[PDB]
Amino acid sequence: PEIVDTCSLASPASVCRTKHLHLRCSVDFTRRTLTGTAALTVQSQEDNLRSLVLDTKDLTIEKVVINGQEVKYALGERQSYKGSPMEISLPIALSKNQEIVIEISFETSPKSSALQWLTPEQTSGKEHPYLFSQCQAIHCRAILPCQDTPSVKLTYTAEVSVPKELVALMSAIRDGETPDPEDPSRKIYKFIQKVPIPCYLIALVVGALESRQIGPRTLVWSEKEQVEKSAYEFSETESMLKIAEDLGGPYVWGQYDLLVLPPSFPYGGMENPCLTFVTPTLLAGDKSLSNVIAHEISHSWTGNLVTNKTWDHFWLNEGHTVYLERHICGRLFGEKFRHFNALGGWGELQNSVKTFGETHPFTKLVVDLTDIDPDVAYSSVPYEKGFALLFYLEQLLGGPEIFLGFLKAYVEKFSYKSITTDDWKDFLYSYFKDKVDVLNQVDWNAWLYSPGLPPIKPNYDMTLTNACIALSQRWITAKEDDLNSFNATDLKDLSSHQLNEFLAQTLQRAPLPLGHIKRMQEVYNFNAINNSEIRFRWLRLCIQSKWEDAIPLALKMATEQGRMKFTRPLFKDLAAFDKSHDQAVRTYQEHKASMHPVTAMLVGKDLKVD
């Protein structure tokens, strides 16, 4: 009854398991390489184990040492996005449960899909270079040889040599700094991660970083020019951590720091333990995009403690995290607000299913990533279809207080483990044993394994959404002689969240007539809003409605930041608009080399370029 991770070429957990990584490396900005040694403490799960295989991707291996002597190893042929398997011949056959240390000397490639190297010009300060990693889902193998599967969890320690003027941070507790004895122009930063983690949660950033304390267990880190704005934007972090602890149980990770990255960071956030990474596009100036922080906080339980065993079961990570996320927002801002955000999430699920197609394999909750690059499959589906299932179960099983009881018991049960959907379902049934008749009424096969929208839509309070729908419908049904009736006062009683939902509702019916869009700018002045989510949707609405004036604005947003949620749809819209098509392609070509490697790959596919 053993499980296989079809995204990894390494030996499975049933054969051997990495227990610890000690990384010693040096960051060479001149060569854009990370060079050093990864010492893996590995425990045999088999009798008479004589070899094992590790994942690698575009790595250069110098040597492998065990027991102080070099051993034989072989790199297999590259298997596309999975990389190349590295088979290691053990000097002495191992008995079950025996542990040894394997020290591998390696160097990364400048084109490592895990890394983005930034020139000084690409940073805020314009004087120093900058490096950051992004290992999820399967890019850790592009930094170091490892069993690159979430089915294995390990602790780690690291020593990182960097230019003395720069700072290194990792997904771990800081353990001091000293000058580098082998090069006085450099400093060594040390780190300890004492809680076992999957290797996709290993993270490294190197740059001219400064910190400010914003809570009892939270520093914000960024380049100097962003520190003050970040400190204010994320000031509710400790209050959210407090609520999360109430819902999930104790926070076991020690510190909860935030790092605000350069604009090319590909996602809204990444839940790296001890150090959440976030996009600077959260800096709206009014804390309105703070749900992303609530999301990353929640991962400290769902995802980082209870982890998906393979990426086929990613919805376990994201569905429960979004569920907890929206409860944090519900406690902060009220239950009607939780329902508003939930209903918005259904709307995002609609968009994703319509984008992929209602029969597409990636619209299933549990997917099959055999021979599929995870970055290509990545979408809102596991997030929102996952949340929808949990929200549906909440309402079926007696309400939020009852289901939050399940959530906390679930985290407790599977803490420090990696699990499948069947593990989750088995415990759901165990926990709600007295309500199995209700559980047996859900169409499990449809919810878990069928494409398309779920077989049943949950009940949503409409209170906060109603004004958004009403105004969107006024615009959509408006004829030319109705345009005069619209006025800035229309927006008087709408929050930024409601303005965003108004645009989301309207974008779902785009295009609108060009004259309507021009009137919208005339009376609402949406061009003036810097809120990234609002501006994103407004610009999409403009381009899809064929307003040439918006072309430079859309091109600017698409390139001045690199969050894929924004950059990909903007480029795709610009490509589909005949007037901007050639310029969209030219702009991608010009920027490609300086984009994040994953983002460059996906925009290229989207644009059918190269």
Ligand X SMILES: NCC(=O)Nc1ccc(OCc2ccccc2)cc1
**Cα-Cα-Cα-Cα dihedral sign, residues 516, 522, 525, 527:** positive
Reduce the DSSP state of residue 336 to 3 states and report it.
Answer: helix
Q: Are strands 49-56 and 115-118 parallel, antiparallel or unpaired?
A: unpaired
First and final C-alpha spacing in the chain: 43
Smallest gap from residue 268 Cβ to ligand X (A): 7
Smallest gap from residue 379 Cβ to ligand X (A): 6
C-beta of residue 167 within 8 angstroms of C-beta of residue 188 = no
Choosing from 66, 240, 241, 270, the residue that interacts with ligand X (CB under 6 A) is 270
Interface with ligand X: number of residues (CB under 6 A): 12
Choosing from 117, 130, 378, 538, the residue that interacts with ligand X (CB under 6 A) is 378
E strands, 407-468, in order: 417-419
Of 212-220, 312-320, 460-468, 574-582: span binding Zn ion (CB under 5 A): 312-320
| Positions in 475-494 near Zn ion (CB under 5 A) | none
Point out the annotated binding site.
Answer: 134-136, 266-271, 295, 299, 318, 563-565
Of 119-127, 137-145, 313-321, 428-436: span binding Zn ion (CB under 5 A): 313-321
Interface with Zn ion: number of residues (CB under 5 A): 2
Q: Which residue in 103, 223, 296, 533 is the catalytic one? A: 296
Query: Which residue bears the tokens 């994942």?
Result: 55
Chain Cα centroid distance, residue 430: 31
Binding residues (CB under 5 A) for Yb ion: these are 479, 481
What mask of x and - would describe binding to ligand X in positions 299 to 318, judged by CB under 6 A?
------------x--x----
Query: Which residue bears the tokens 């303005």?
Result: 499
DSSP string, 427-465: HHHHHTGGGHHHHTTS-HHHHHH--SS-SSPPP---TTT
Does residue 561 interact with ligand X by CB under 6 A? no
Of 232-240, 311-319, 454-462, 472-480: span binding Zn ion (CB under 5 A): 311-319
Smallest gap from residue 535 Cβ to ligand X (A): 21
Tell me which DSSP letter residue 606 carries.
Answer: H
Breaks (C-N over 2.5 A) in the chain follow: none
Smallest gap from residue 451 Cβ to ligand X (A): 13
User: Active site includes 480?
Assistant: no
User: Active site includes 296?
Assistant: yes
C-beta of residue 553 within 8 angstroms of C-beta of residue 539 = yes
Please tell me whether the peptide bond between 511 and the residue prior to it is cis, using omega within 30 degrees of 0. Answer: yes
Residue 30: count of CB within 10 angstroms of its CB? 7
Does residue 557 interact with ligand X by CB under 6 A? no
Question: At residue 562, what are phi and psi to the nearest 5 degrees?
Answer: -135, 15
Q: Which residue in 156, 256, 383, 524 is the catalytic one? A: 383
E strands, 367-504, in order: 417-419
Residue 367: name its binding partner from Zn ion, ligand X, Yb ion, none (Cβ under 5 to 8 Å by kind). ligand X
* Nearest in space to 432 (alpha carbons), one of 483, 471, 372, 390: 390
Cβ closest to Zn ion, residue 234 vs residue 267 = 267
Cβ closest to Yb ion, residue 91 vs residue 513 = 513
Smallest gap from residue 7 Cβ to Yb ion (A): 57
Does residue 558 interact with ligand X by CB under 6 A? no
Of 96-104, 176-184, 317-325, 455-463: span binding Zn ion (CB under 5 A): 317-325
Smallest gap from residue 284 Cβ to ligand X (A): 19
d(CA 426, CA 435): 13
| Positions in 319-338 near Zn ion (CB under 5 A) | 321
Residue 52: count of CB within 10 angstroms of its CB? 22
Taking CA atoms, 155 is separated from 26, 37, 196, 425, 554, in Å, by 20, 16, 4, 28, 44
Site for ligand X, rule CB under 6 A: 136-137, 267, 270, 311, 314, 367, 374-375, 377-378, 382
> Contact residues for Zn ion (CB under 5 A)?
318, 321
**Which residues carry out catalysis?**
296, 383
